[PDB]
Write a structure and sequence with these properties.
Two copies of one chain form a homodimer.
Chain A (H helix, E strand, L loop, with lengths): L2 E2 L7 E9 L3 E8 L5 E8 L6 H13 L8 E6 L3 E7 L6 H8 L4 H20 L12 E3 L5 E3 L9 H11 L7 H9 L6 H15 L9 H8 L17 H10 L10 H5 L2 H4 L6 H11 L2
Parallel strand pairs in A: 1-5
Antiparallel strand pairs in A: 2-3, 3-4, 4-6, 5-6, 7-8
Bound molecules: ligand YK7 (2 copies).
One ligand YK7 binds next to strand 2 and strand 6 of chain A.
Chain lengths: 289, 287
């Protein structure tokens, strides 16, 4: 992996802040000569970080190439700030879209779900977990194509990791099994399938289930023995295949819950007429209400 | 939970310490003159009073000699106060920082009393989650009490910090939520932590204290991870080395219970009593 030890401000002009958090910032940026629009993700680098692990993580981003995953172009390390140059998605997230357009149609949701599953089946074949499938992390380009934004780079380095360590507290008295869970958590690969189920409801209804209920209460209810997975609110609005998609994706037991490959053979996402045109209609609704 | 003012019951003397768990004061009883520890916990607006009542009933019922005694609770001006037994010599950390390292017999006594505390807690289906020198308290009689900060974790600032840390749960799968709440802590993790504490008391620091915490977490999770040991071999007996070996079993399935550990030579030997700690408190007063 060629991490360029140079200022990215020489190569790109930063236009507009798209978003950010503790990890750092993501900008819309223009290439100075070539004129390509890119997404430039600034990641804050703390002084006692392994450069070898950073190299392995950028190598993981370089090797992770797939149509439904946002493309990696290159890296810059300059003044304890890692910059990751990526594919720009000009319509933002599905969240940004649905907040203006209102709820997606069933065919639109079916197309989105197929493309996310294609993305997830690839990530799971590489022994990765997305960990955060939601409307806000599914990006849409001007062509109506679907890309997953991958925030996994911030987990292994920088301020997001430093904040995770502060929350976990001192580890010196902690047992191996407790340390294992502090790093990993409950995240396995099939948790992304659950999250997609919730996302499909989110796109259908403008909120995930229990969005107005307090988060601790939701967490307690999810962990009970007789917890009932959520459902679509209106039954008649949606077809039997869409209800079944939600039913199988929201299987409570991880052992019984179907994989991304399994889900790609489901009726909802395997039907004909699912293409980017459906999202071009959505982007037209956004522009001309 | 008494809706009276705790100012009517107690006068707050001196701040003992603080954190996310809350502020803790030394306080005197107005009538009886008895000294107590009053743990102030700030109440956030979206805290379930019904769950707080169920948690305090668990604290009220959990009575044992080696656990800090619960006297009562007072809710006044969006501040939960938890009145508890006072331990006038502070933590073992506060002590060893002045006295230096504990002797083997002193550590053996401490370990017996912690294990008595833990065997009780585990019989009640609880986990302490935080066994260390700073949370093992010593009264003026040289007796050993476990401080329980678990009550503060489910409400107030510690709850608000937990929720910020986990993030929004609405897209989260049941198995992921389960682990976000539980956090890997089972009952036998307290036995590991006591093993580390025994080294801490022996050497003034846990193992790997100068190593970065993330690095320690990674090393602990590797296949060939070697549990720590006491640095000096000749200073400590074979029974103390064995105590550290069995308590620091890597596999939770193979690691012995608190009841099992109470029959171990180190903690089952004669001459383990509070006198050992009264000598330590005398060393603290006159070095
Ligand atoms: C016109 O493009 C947008 C607009 C808005 C967003 C996003 C975009 N595009 C966009 N494309 C590509 C990426 C990428 N390679 O990861 C990205 N990342 C990103 C942005 C922000 C935060 C966190 C990650 N973002 C975000 N919304 C919150 C407000 C508007
Ligand atoms: C003279 O008593 C002390 C002195 C010092 C401390 C503690 C005590 N007593 C003491 N007794 C009982 C308790 C209890 N019901 O849980 C307690 N809580 C507590 C624990 C941890 C921290 C701060 C408070 N504290 C703490 N040290 C860190 C500094 C000095």
């Amino acid at each position: 992996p060629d991490i360029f030890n140079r200022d990215p401000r020489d190569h790109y002009d930063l236009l507009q802040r798209l978003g950010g958090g503790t990890y750092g910032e993501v900008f819309k940026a223009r290439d100075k000569v070539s004129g390509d629009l890119v997404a430039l993700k600034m990641v804050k680098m703390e002084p006692d970080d392994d450069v070898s692990t950073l190299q392995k993580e950028i190598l993981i981003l370089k090797t992770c190439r797939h149509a439904n995953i946002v493309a990696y172009h290159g890296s810059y390390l300059w003044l304890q700030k890692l910059w990751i140059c990526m594919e720009f998605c000009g319509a933002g997230s599905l969240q940004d879209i649905y907040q203006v357009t209102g709820s997606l149609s069933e065919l639109q949701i079916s197309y989105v779900c197929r493309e996310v599953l294609q993305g997830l089946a690839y990530l799971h074949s590489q022994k990765k977990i997305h960990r955060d499938i939601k409307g806000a992390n599914i990006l849409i380009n001007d062509a109506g194509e679907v890309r997953l934004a991958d925030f996994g780079i911030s987990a292994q380095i920088g301020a997001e990791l430093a904040r995770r360590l502060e929350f976990i507290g001192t580890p010196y008295w902690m047992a191996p099994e407790v340390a294992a869970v502090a790093l990993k958590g409950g995240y396995n690969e099939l948790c992304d399938i659950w999250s997609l189920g919730i996302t499909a409801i989110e796109l259908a209804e403008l909120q995930p289930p229990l969005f107005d209920v307090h988060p601790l209460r939701v967490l307690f209810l999810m962990t009970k023995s007789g917890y009932q997975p959520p459902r679509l609110k209106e039954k008649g609005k949606w077809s039997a295949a869409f209800h079944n998609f939600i039913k199988v994706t929201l299987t409570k037991s991880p052992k019984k819950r179907p994989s991304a490959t399994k889900m790609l053979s489901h009726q909802l996402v395997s039907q004909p007429g699912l293409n980017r045109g459906l999202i071009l209609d959505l982007l037209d609704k956004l522009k001309n209400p």
